[PDB]
């Protein structure tokens, strides 16, 4: 599952926890097996403005 | 007030809307302990000290 | 105290009974010896501690 985030939401996705992302966007189960990689992405997907 | 000087109210006989303070999302952090935050709307407490 | 041994087997079992009862009204380390509160006042990933 592939997309792109805040930086000061790369805690937000995980197990258990709590906010508009998890909620709304992206939930993780209480039994999540497996694993998150996060990488920033400013130098390669934001553009000046 | 200051942290040493840190401002009490008391918070009894009323009904309390705790809907509105989760999802005005004007606050950076909002954790909770002992207690889950989505049922806050459905408990009655006997005092609250903020 | 003539039946004191047909009475001794009962106020056993009756003493039995009631510490097993009351053994409900402990915490065991959990915040509230009540199970209904704790259900309705935590969600479930750190209510299953």
């Given at each position: 599952?592939?997309?792109?985030?805040?930086?000061?939401?790369?805690?937000?996705?995980?197990?258990?926890?709590?906010?508009?992302?998890?909620?709304?966007?992206?939930?993780?189960?209480?039994?999540?097996?497996?694993?998150?990689?996060?990488?920033?992405?400013?130098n390669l997907d934001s553009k000046v403005? | 007030?200051?942290?040493?000087?840190?401002?009490?109210?008391?918070?009894?006989?009323?009904?309390?809307?705790?809907?509105?303070?989760?999802?005005?999302?004007?606050?950076?952090?909002?954790?909770?302990?002992?207690?889950?935050?989505?049922?806050?709307?459905?408990?009655?407490?006997?005092?609250?000290?903020? | 105290?003539?039946?004191?041994?047909?009475?001794?087997?009962?106020?056993?079992?009756?003493?039995?009974?009631?510490?097993?009862?009351?053994?409900?009204?402990?915490?065991?380390?959990?915040?509230?010896?009540?199970?209904?509160?704790?259900?309705?006042?935590?969600?479930?990933?750190?209510?299953?501690?």
């Amino acid at each position: 599952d592939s997309f792109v985030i805040r930086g000061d939401e790369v805690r937000q996705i995980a197990p258990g926890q709590t906010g508009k992302i998890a909620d709304y966007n992206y939930k993780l189960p209480d039994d999540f097996t497996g694993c998150v990689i996060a990488w920033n992405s400013n130098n390669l997907d934001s553009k000046v403005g | 007030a200051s942290v040493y000087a840190w401002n009490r109210k008391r918070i009894s006989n009323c009904v309390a809307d705790y809907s509105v303070l989760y999802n005005s999302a004007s606050f950076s952090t909002f954790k909770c302990y002992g207690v889950s935050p989505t049922k806050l709307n459905d408990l009655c407490f006997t005092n609250v000290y903020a | 105290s003539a039946l004191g041994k047909l009475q001794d087997v009962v106020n056993q079992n009756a003493q039995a009974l009631n510490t097993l009862v009351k053994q409900l009204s402990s915490n065991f380390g959990a915040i509230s010896s009540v199970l209904n509160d704790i259900l309705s006042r935590l969600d479930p990933p750190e209510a299953e501690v």
